[PDB]
Amino acid sequence: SWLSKTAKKLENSAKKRISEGIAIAIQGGPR
């Protein structure tokens, strides 16, 4: 995973970890 050292209420790198799963989830989802 890595990254996301701080996201208690800022989310600086938490959007990168999701961009991996959300990228494939939508790539083959209902869109």
Side-chain angles (χ1 to χ4, degrees):
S1 37
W2 232 62
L3 312 116
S4 317
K5 242 83 238 141
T6 46
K8 194 194 147 202
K9 49 120 260 250
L10 37 129
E11 212 188 301
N12 62 316
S13 247
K15 61 87 234 254
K16 212 116 244 284
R17 78 209 292 189
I18 71 181
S19 104
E20 224 230 297
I22 203 180
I24 67 180
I26 301 171
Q27 168 55 38
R31 200 247 92 169

